Amino acid sequence: FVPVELATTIPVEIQQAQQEIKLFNKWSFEDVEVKDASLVDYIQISKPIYVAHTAGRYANKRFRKAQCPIVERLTNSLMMNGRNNGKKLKAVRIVKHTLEIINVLTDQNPLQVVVDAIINSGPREDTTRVGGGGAARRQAVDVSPLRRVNQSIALLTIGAREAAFRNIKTIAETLAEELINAAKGSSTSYAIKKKDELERVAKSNR
Amino acid sequence: DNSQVFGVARIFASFNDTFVHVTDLSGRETIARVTGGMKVKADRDESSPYAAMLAAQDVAAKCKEVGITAVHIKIRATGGTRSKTPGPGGQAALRALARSGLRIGRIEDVTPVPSDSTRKKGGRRGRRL
C-alpha cells in the first residue's frame, strides 16, 4: 500500500501507510472511550504516540502532569522498590508485553481495557486525619479527579508488584491480569479490593 | 387547601443526640419518634448533622407510609437552664425534612426560656474545663 523507494529500505509495516499513528504500531487510540464523564481531560488518549517514553518537562508546572500520556504514567509508576527506580526501558518493555497480553485476553483493543481499569479502581471518597490528639476520628472527604487517576495508577502497579514478588508469575502478566480484573468489577484484583476498602472506611465514617 | 394532612415534626436539637418526633396537630399521637442516636455508632456524633439526615430521612419515610404530607416545625433547644441555643444537628434535620418529599410550613421556635430561676448548674466559678 504505497511504498516509497529510498536508498535505505524501511521495513514493510513501518513504511506502508503509517500516517495513522499507533501506540506500538499495533494498538490504536481511536475507538478508546472514557466511561466516567469526570476523568476525561485527565487522560491524554487524544494525543497519539509511537512509543510509551517521551522525556518531556511534565512536572515543572502545577497541572502539566495531566498532559502526560496515560500509558507513560503507568510505565513510570511500574518502577518501584527503590532499586529499580530508573530503567524505563525495562518498564516500557513490561508494559508493551502487558498490552500484548490484554490483546490476548479479551481481544478488546487493550488501551480501552487499561483506561477502563483506571476509571473503575478510583476511590471516590477518602478519609482525613482530623481528630485532635485525644478523640481521634476519621473524616470522610471527597476526592480530586486527578487524584483519583493517580491513586488508581498507584494501586494498580502496587497490586502488580505484590503479585509478582518472589512469584513464578511475571510482572508483565500479573499487571495484565490485574488490568483484566479491573476492567470489570472483579474483586479478585487487589487494586479494586483496596479501592472498596477505602470507600467503605470513608462511608462508615461519614 | 388541597388536603395537606398536617403534622408537626418537633425537632429537639441539643448539643448532643438531637431528636425528630413527628406527631399530630394536638401532639397527642406520635409518628416515628426515631431519634439521632438511632442511626449512628460513635455516641459522640449523635449531635452531628449526619445523624440529623439519617433520622430525618427515616422519619420522613414513616411519614409517607402513614399518610402525613405537610409538617409544621417546633424547633427546640435544651432550653430551661441549659444554654438556650439550638443544637448543631437539628438544622440539618430541618434541611432533610425540607428535601424528602414532605411539604413544610410555619417554622417556629419553642425553646423554653425561663424567667430567671432554678440556679444554673455549675457553681459560682462554673465549669472549669
Binding site: 481521634a136 462508615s204 | 455508632k41
Partner: protein, 150 residues
C-alpha cells in the same frame, strides 16, 4: 480441612456478637479472620477499638489471639465484615464468651470425627450438628443429652 461455620447462615447478622482471631494490621485497624462464622475476615477500626484513648496500637490487638467482636453492617454480596470491639457491653462480652466456647467444643469434637473419617466437615455439620441445634437450640446441650439419653 477446617470449614463449615457454627451457626445457620454463613454471613454474620444484625447486631450479633462474635469473636475474632487477629493476624494483620495495616492502617485503619485490622481486617482479620473469624472463628465463630466460616473463616471470613472483618475490619476492626481504630476509632472503635478500645474504651481508653488509643495510646498504642500493638498492645491492645495481640495478633494471633482471641478477641471480642460485633458486626455492624454485613456485606451480604461478597464476604466483607464491618466489625467493632469497643461497643460490646460488659455483661455482653462474657455471655458471648460462653456462646463462643459453646460453639467451639462441638467443632473440636466433629473435627476429630471428620479427620478420622476423612469426610469434609460440611457434610458432618449438615447431617448431625444442624438438626441438633434445631432440636435443642445448642449442639452442646444435644451432646449432653446424648450422654444421658440415647
Amino acid at each position: 480441612t477446617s470449614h463449615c461455620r457454627f451457626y445457620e447462615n454463613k454471613y454474620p447478622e444484625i447486631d450479633d456478637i462474635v469473636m475474632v482471631n487477629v493476624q494483620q494490621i495495616a492502617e485503619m485497624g485490622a481486617y482479620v479472620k473469624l472463628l465463630e462464622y466460616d473463616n471470613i475476615e472483618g475490619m476492626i477500626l481504630l476509632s472503635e477499638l478500645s474504651r481508653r484513648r488509643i495510646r498504642s496500637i500493638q498492645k491492645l490487638i495481640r495478633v494471633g489471639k482471641n478477641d471480642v467482636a460485633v458486626v455492624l453492617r454485613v456485606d451480604k454480596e461478597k464476604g466483607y465484615i464491618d466489625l467493632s470491639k469497643r461497643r460490646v457491653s460488659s455483661e455482653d462480652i462474657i455471655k458471648c464468651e460462653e456462646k463462643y466456647q459453646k460453639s467451639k467444643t462441638v467443632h473440636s469434637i466433629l473435627r476429630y470425627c471428620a479427620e478420622k473419617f476423612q469426610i469434609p466437615l460440611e457434610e458432618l455439620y449438615k447431617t448431625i450438628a444442624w438438626p441438633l441445634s434445631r432440636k435443642f437450640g445448642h449442639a452442646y446441650e444435644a451432646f449432653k443429652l446424648s450422654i444421658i439419653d440415647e
